[PDB]
Amino acid sequence: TIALSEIVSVVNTSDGRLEVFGVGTDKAVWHNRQMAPHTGSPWSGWSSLKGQVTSKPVVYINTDGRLEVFARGTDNALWHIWQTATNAGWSNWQSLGGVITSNPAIYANTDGRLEVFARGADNALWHISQTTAHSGPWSSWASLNGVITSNPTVHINSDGRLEVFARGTDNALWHIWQTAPDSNLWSSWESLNGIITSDPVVIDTADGRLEVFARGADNALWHIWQTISHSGPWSGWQSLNGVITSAPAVAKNCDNRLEAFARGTDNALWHTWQTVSHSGPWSSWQSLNGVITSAPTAVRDADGRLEVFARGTDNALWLTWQTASSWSPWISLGGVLIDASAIK
Amino acid sequence: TIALSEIVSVVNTSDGRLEVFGVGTDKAVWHNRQMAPHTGSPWSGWSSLKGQVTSKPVVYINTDGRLEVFARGTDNALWHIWQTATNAGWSNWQSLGGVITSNPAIYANTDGRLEVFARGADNALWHISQTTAHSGPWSSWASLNGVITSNPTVHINSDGRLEVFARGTDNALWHIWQTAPDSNLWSSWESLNGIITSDPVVIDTADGRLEVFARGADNALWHIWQTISHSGPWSGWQSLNGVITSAPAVAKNCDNRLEAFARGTDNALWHTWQTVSHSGPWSSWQSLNGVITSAPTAVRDADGRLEVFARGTDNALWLTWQTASSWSPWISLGGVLIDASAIK
Ligand SMILES: C#CCO[C@@H]1O[C@@H](C)[C@@H](O)[C@@H](O)[C@@H]1O
Ligand SMILES: C#CCO[C@@H]1O[C@@H](C)[C@@H](O)[C@@H](O)[C@@H]1O
Ligand SMILES: C#CCO[C@@H]1O[C@@H](C)[C@@H](O)[C@@H](O)[C@@H]1O
Ligand SMILES: C#CCO[C@@H]1O[C@@H](C)[C@@H](O)[C@@H](O)[C@@H]1O
Ligand SMILES: C#CCO[C@@H]1O[C@@H](C)[C@@H](O)[C@@H](O)[C@@H]1O
Ligand SMILES: C#CCO[C@@H]1O[C@@H](C)[C@@H](O)[C@@H](O)[C@@H]1O
Ligand SMILES: C#CCO[C@@H]1O[C@@H](C)[C@@H](O)[C@@H](O)[C@@H]1O
Ligand SMILES: C#CCO[C@@H]1O[C@@H](C)[C@@H](O)[C@@H](O)[C@@H]1O
Ligand SMILES: C#CCO[C@@H]1O[C@@H](C)[C@@H](O)[C@@H](O)[C@@H]1O
Ligand SMILES: C#CCO[C@@H]1O[C@@H](C)[C@@H](O)[C@@H](O)[C@@H]1O
Ligand SMILES: C#CCO[C@@H]1O[C@@H](C)[C@@H](O)[C@@H](O)[C@@H]1O
Ligand SMILES: [Cl-]
Ligand SMILES: [Cl-]
Ligand SMILES: [Cl-]
Ligand SMILES: [Cl-]
Ligand SMILES: [Cl-]
Ligand SMILES: [Cl-]
Ligand SMILES: [Cl-]
Ligand SMILES: [Cl-]
Ligand SMILES: [Cl-]
Ligand SMILES: [Cl-]
Ligand SMILES: [Cl-]
Ligand code: NA
Ligand code: NA
Ligand code: NA
Ligand code: NA
Ligand code: NA
Ligand code: NA
Ligand code: NA
Ligand code: NA
Ligand code: NA
């Protein structure tokens, strides 16, 4: 097991609007969209993209601006659905085959080819990619081996090499990387040690370093980073303290200051932020109240403000966002959302 | 002729630092680099990349983070130099051939292939591209025809299609675009009318629209935009008033509010910005003082603040930046810079 997961995936679209994707009580993927590219825009309300899924659905934006949603099907294959043109109609659901046992994780290579990562039937890391920029057809499936016990997360280094993070059978954070951008040649697996009790969360800092966050054995929020832009040595593990009861979420403020969010022991949303600037020391933890039943999902909107989403006690998706002074009151976006994560 | 040009090219690097590139009294390309990814970082001092150039040198970042600098050579061919690895050593200068009669303009396609645009010996628009993502060899040159009378400027639409802007023989703003992302198929030329007396300056908005700024026949700053995300019809020309004596520079604040900069009749730096939000009305023009002998160059740094560069009365490069309350006083980065613009 791992800490409680995020309930939605979110994207800031090609036209600057937030769109959130989750799973309904009918096992379809539903989505909810800002009308306008601003903090506090009205929302569409929940709308179904149909299908029947058995993982968290994960939205990604192609390099031509088209949204694409990936999810495990009822046959355990990887399935996907995409906008046929930027901000336009959706394709039918289509299978990418395989047999997967985690949520999918997606990134664009430097050549615009989406690459998708998931755990396999064998508990190894597997991957598949677009054969040309922002387009099918897709490659055959292949394995990066290893044996992993969390959902994988992928990011891109500031030199263009993809890098994947996952928990190992010893509960340490492990990782593996492309040897060159767009490459099919990957490193050996390497351990970054620690004991982690959530999915890892990875972000790129303003200064080009990968930084990984995860709940520890003591239920504190911990992090570890590349000390040099796209390069080792990594730092030691460092504690940001707290006691958290979900996976964390991390986003960059307007000024690049990292900010981490998680559910607290009182089930409120809590957060801690870098102070002064993006190189800065982290603040003490502070509560944003509420009573939540998922990990939070954080994202920076087109006004440069953080917006945080979490499921509530009524199973609706609730929302709060940064204002000048403070944070806004929690508001409900309604709906009934379930946690369909393929690893819990 | 066109309004006075910018003296440097600037990039916010893969690791978050500002680096500026200009032409020294020896006609070599020189550069100056922030040590750290923060407003008010100390600078390296000017350092030479050698070469002998007869255009403004134009820096662009490959999709793998490697800087690449483009410039017209003493033989009028397009020349370039690149980092051999991200943020590391530089190649030798190499020729991409052709005969060009403007500064070069560069954008990355959605497939990661850089494409460069320049006016040719025939006065038409020409282009050349990398044949694979962030790598040579380059394609053959081809023409998009037209007859142009300014430096061209390229940008990417929110659906991934490159689009190029230039002044025509009638002094109107003309443009031309890819019919699909990464394509060798382009539109016919189309006129956006108006009378322009500077190079056009293009930026993408938070909501995915191309917006173009130019000095008008009355020496006011004018602009015009796509009405629908990545699509015509375009707006009317609208005036932002002022009386300006250089090319404008435009950048996005970290909340996406556009902000334009230009030298005034008194040779000081002046600016006007969007208020409220990125969909807000523009402020009155305000002075940032200084006495400057080039157009200003504006860029957002890794603290989310705008920084503006301009040549001074002593031919050094000077710098002011946004602060909480105000703007910083002008500071000198030293050096002696010449205006090597191919079109004056
Ligand atoms: C519109 C609407 C809201 O619908 C609710 O929320 C959706 C996300 C689904 O769970 C539906 O089954 C449920 O009824
Ligand atoms: C076409 C289509 C959609 O298919 C549904 O949704 C897919 C994601 C799979 O779960 C299929 O097994 C299921 O029938
Ligand atoms: C080298 C290597 C691969 O290691 C495997 O996969 C890693 C991710 C860990 O789970 C190890 O405990 C396991 O043996
Ligand atoms: C190629 C290569 C090397 O990759 C880098 O250096 C490795 C030794 C690891 O520290 C990775 O996190 C990092 O991306
Ligand atoms: C250290 C600290 C901050 O607070 C702790 O961690 C927070 C996230 C909450 O869980 C509190 O209930 C708990 O006391
Ligand atoms: C404070 C507040 C807002 O409301 C609380 O937190 C929300 C996220 C919901 O769980 C409500 O049911 C709960 O009452
Ligand atoms: C070091 C240094 C600064 O050098 C000055 O500024 C450079 C940009 C060149 O013009 C040199 O010729 C001049 O001497
Ligand atoms: C190699 C090299 C450097 O060459 C100089 O700089 C290049 C950019 C060209 O102008 C050459 O013609 C000139 O000789
Ligand atoms: C069609 C076409 C191209 O038109 C040419 O190129 C345009 C950019 C203008 O300069 C016209 O005045 C000129 O005739
Ligand atoms: C394909 C296509 C259409 O291109 C768009 O629509 C055209 C009519 C122009 O407005 C361009 O500025 C824009 O890029
Ligand atoms: C006001 C001010 C700061 O300085 C002025 O503007 C600078 C940009 C230089 O031109 C100086 O030589 C001049 O004195
Ligand atoms: Cl609804
Ligand atoms: Cl379907
Ligand atoms: Cl993540
Ligand atoms: Cl700290
Ligand atoms: Cl944005
Ligand atoms: Cl010369
Ligand atoms: Cl070549
Ligand atoms: Cl050629
Ligand atoms: Cl421009
Ligand atoms: Cl930045
Ligand atoms: Cl000069
Ligand atoms: Na769009
Ligand atoms: Na966006
Ligand atoms: Na295979
Ligand atoms: Na990721
Ligand atoms: Na970064
Ligand atoms: Na950057
Ligand atoms: Na460097
Ligand atoms: Na451009
Ligand atoms: Na945009």
Side-chain angles (χ1 to χ4, degrees), chain A residues 1-26 28-344, chain B residues 1-324 326-344:
Chain A
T1 68
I2 51 164
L4 185 61
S5 296
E6 294 183 30
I7 201 85
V8 284
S9 52
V10 61
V11 71
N12 180 317
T13 59
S14 65
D15 65 327
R17 297 169 305 93
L18 302 184
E19 303 196 357
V20 298
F21 294 77
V23 185
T25 55
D26 58 357
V29 179
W30 296 71
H31 77 314
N32 203 340
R33 324 182 290 287
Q34 287 183 321
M35 194 185 193
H38 295 292
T39 314
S41 169
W43 291 82
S44 57
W46 295 97
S47 178
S48 181
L49 291 173
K50 295 165 42 178
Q52 297 288 283
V53 301
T54 61
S55 81
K56 187 195 173 175
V58 181
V59 63
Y60 198 88
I61 186 162
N62 281 276
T63 60
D64 67 1
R66 291 178 311 96
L67 301 187
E68 190 152 353
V69 178
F70 296 88
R72 190 173 63 178
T74 59
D75 59 4
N76 296 302
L78 177 62
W79 288 71
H80 70 142
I81 188 170
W82 61 93
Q83 287 179 335
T84 60
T86 309
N87 213 20
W90 291 85
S91 71
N92 295 321
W93 280 99
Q94 308 271 117
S95 174
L96 284 173
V99 171
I100 60 168
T101 60
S102 71
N103 296 333
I106 308 94
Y107 223 92
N109 285 279
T110 65
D111 67 6
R113 295 178 308 98
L114 297 190
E115 192 154 353
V116 178
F117 298 84
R119 191 173 70 176
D122 62 358
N123 303 297
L125 178 63
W126 293 69
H127 70 133
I128 190 172
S129 61
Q130 284 169 343
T131 58
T132 57
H134 55 71
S135 183
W138 288 66
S139 77
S140 64
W141 277 105
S143 189
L144 296 174
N145 314 299
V147 178
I148 65 172
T149 63
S150 75
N151 293 297
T153 179
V154 59
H155 214 75
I156 198 162
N157 279 285
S158 57
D159 70 353
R161 294 176 304 98
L162 300 182
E163 186 156 342
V164 187
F165 297 83
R167 193 173 64 179
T169 52
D170 55 4
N171 300 304
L173 177 64
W174 287 75
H175 67 141
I176 194 170
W177 51 94
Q178 284 174 338
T179 53
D182 320 315
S183 192
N184 285 320
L185 303 188
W186 287 71
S187 69
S188 301
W189 279 98
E190 172 189 277
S191 181
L192 290 164
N193 313 117
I195 303 294
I196 67 175
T197 62
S198 72
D199 285 338
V201 173
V202 62
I203 198 158
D204 64 286
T205 65
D207 63 320
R209 295 168 311 90
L210 295 188
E211 186 158 337
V212 181
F213 294 77
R215 185 174 70 180
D218 51 1
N219 297 313
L221 181 62
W222 293 75
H223 64 148
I224 189 174
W225 56 91
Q226 288 177 335
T227 63
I228 292 170
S229 182
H230 62 267
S231 179
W234 285 65
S235 71
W237 283 99
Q238 202 198 236
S239 180
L240 291 172
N241 311 120
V243 183
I244 62 172
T245 60
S246 79
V250 186
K252 278 180 280 188
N253 284 277
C254 214
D255 65 3
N256 283 308
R257 286 173 314 94
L258 299 176
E259 191 158 340
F261 299 82
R263 192 176 68 179
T265 63
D266 59 351
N267 295 316
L269 178 59
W270 287 73
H271 68 140
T272 172
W273 54 97
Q274 293 192 282
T275 59
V276 175
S277 77
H278 76 75
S279 62
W282 288 75
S283 72
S284 59
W285 282 92
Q286 169 193 103
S287 176
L288 292 169
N289 309 116
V291 180
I292 56 177
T293 65
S294 68
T297 298
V299 67
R300 193 179 64 265
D301 67 26
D303 293 331
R305 299 186 185 104
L306 301 185
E307 303 210 20
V308 181
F309 302 86
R311 191 170 61 175
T313 56
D314 52 4
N315 298 310
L317 192 64
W318 293 67
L319 167 61
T320 180
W321 60 74
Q322 292 178 323
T323 66
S325 33
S326 189
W327 281 68
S328 66
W330 283 99
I331 63 101
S332 182
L333 302 187
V336 184
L337 297 176
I338 69 152
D339 179 7
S341 182
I343 295 178
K344 302 196 179 81
Chain B
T1 63
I2 44 162
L4 185 62
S5 296
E6 291 185 35
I7 203 76
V8 285
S9 191
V10 67
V11 76
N12 177 319
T13 63
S14 64
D15 66 328
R17 290 176 303 96
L18 301 187
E19 303 190 351
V20 298
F21 294 78
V23 184
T25 52
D26 57 357
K27 314 301 298 299
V29 179
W30 293 68
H31 77 319
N32 205 335
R33 319 177 299 282
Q34 297 183 312
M35 193 191 187
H38 295 296
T39 312
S41 166
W43 288 80
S44 60
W46 290 98
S47 193
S48 191
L49 295 170
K50 310 192 63 255
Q52 292 285 274
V53 304
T54 62
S55 79
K56 178 200 182 179
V58 182
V59 61
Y60 197 87
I61 187 161
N62 279 273
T63 56
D64 63 0
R66 293 178 310 96
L67 302 189
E68 191 153 352
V69 175
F70 297 89
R72 190 173 61 167
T74 53
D75 57 5
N76 292 331
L78 175 62
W79 292 69
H80 66 146
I81 191 165
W82 56 94
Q83 294 174 332
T84 60
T86 309
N87 202 20
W90 287 89
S91 65
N92 296 307
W93 282 95
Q94 289 197 18
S95 174
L96 293 169
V99 177
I100 64 171
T101 59
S102 74
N103 304 327
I106 309 96
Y107 224 88
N109 282 281
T110 67
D111 66 6
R113 291 178 310 106
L114 292 193
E115 194 152 355
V116 179
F117 302 82
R119 193 175 63 184
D122 67 358
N123 292 301
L125 180 60
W126 295 71
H127 62 131
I128 193 180
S129 68
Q130 290 173 338
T131 59
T132 64
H134 53 75
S135 185
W138 289 61
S139 69
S140 50
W141 282 95
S143 190
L144 291 166
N145 311 298
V147 179
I148 53 167
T149 65
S150 71
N151 294 297
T153 183
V154 58
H155 212 80
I156 197 160
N157 280 281
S158 62
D159 68 351
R161 293 168 311 94
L162 300 182
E163 190 156 337
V164 182
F165 298 82
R167 192 174 66 182
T169 53
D170 53 13
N171 297 326
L173 173 64
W174 286 73
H175 70 138
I176 191 165
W177 54 89
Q178 281 175 337
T179 57
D182 317 315
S183 183
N184 286 316
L185 302 193
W186 292 68
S187 66
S188 305
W189 280 96
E190 157 180 297
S191 182
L192 292 173
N193 314 112
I195 304 297
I196 62 173
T197 65
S198 70
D199 277 337
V201 169
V202 61
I203 197 149
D204 61 287
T205 62
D207 58 338
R209 286 177 304 96
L210 297 185
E211 184 161 343
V212 178
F213 296 76
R215 195 179 61 173
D218 58 357
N219 301 146
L221 183 59
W222 291 74
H223 68 142
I224 187 180
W225 55 93
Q226 291 179 328
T227 54
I228 298 303
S229 202
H230 68 265
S231 191
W234 288 57
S235 69
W237 282 99
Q238 185 188 259
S239 182
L240 291 168
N241 310 304
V243 200
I244 61 167
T245 59
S246 75
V250 176
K252 279 173 280 180
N253 285 275
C254 74
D255 67 2
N256 288 309
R257 287 178 306 96
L258 296 173
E259 185 155 345
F261 298 87
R263 188 178 69 178
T265 52
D266 61 349
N267 294 314
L269 177 58
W270 291 73
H271 70 144
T272 168
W273 56 94
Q274 288 190 289
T275 58
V276 183
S277 77
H278 70 75
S279 61
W282 289 76
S283 73
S284 299
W285 285 97
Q286 185 192 79
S287 177
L288 291 171
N289 311 131
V291 175
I292 59 169
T293 58
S294 68
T297 295
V299 61
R300 189 176 65 258
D301 71 29
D303 292 332
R305 300 186 189 97
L306 300 180
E307 304 205 22
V308 186
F309 299 86
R311 191 175 64 173
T313 51
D314 55 2
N315 299 304
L317 192 63
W318 294 69
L319 170 53
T320 180
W321 58 77
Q322 281 176 334
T323 61
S326 188
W327 276 70
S328 70
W330 286 99
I331 70 103
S332 180
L333 300 181
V336 184
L337 296 177
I338 79 176
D339 173 8
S341 195
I343 297 172
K344 290 171 177 88

